[PDB]
Amino acid sequence: FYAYYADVGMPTTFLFSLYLGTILSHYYVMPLTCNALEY
Amino acid sequence: LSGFTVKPVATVYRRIPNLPDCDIDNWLNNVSVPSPLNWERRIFSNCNF
Ligand SMILES: *[C@@H]1O[C@H](CO)[C@@H](O[C@@H]2O[C@H](CO)[C@@H](O)[C@H](O)[C@H]2NC(C)=O)[C@H](O)[C@H]1NC(C)=O
């Protein structure tokens, strides 16, 4: 599992790597409960 | 006639000192023996062997 990240600018930079040995299937973005956002 | 190349006069060798060992022998020689169904993986990096 590779993951890049960027704080300033559009091009990203390497952040970390992780080995799991399994195939990822799904992903989900959970909502945020607030009173006072896009993904 | 044929070509020629300038022969080197020295040699540059650069390595990172004071680096720990990979101790791969301790990983292979362990009492806990894995199984071919649930084999694991260990990554050795930034060390000497
Ligand atoms: C052999 O493998 C075992 C794993 O089953 C190693 O035990 C781990 O040791 C590390 C420290 O190096 C601990 O952080 C882990 O919690 C241990 N896992 C356990 C107790 O399940 C062991 O170090 C390896 N080497 C030897 C010589 O036994």
Swiss-Prot record, chain A:
Attaches the virion to the cell membrane by interacting with host receptor, initiating the infection. This is Spike protein S1. It comes from Human coronavirus HKU1 (isolate N5). The lineage of its organism: Viruses, Riboviria, Orthornavirae, Pisuviricota, Pisoniviricetes.
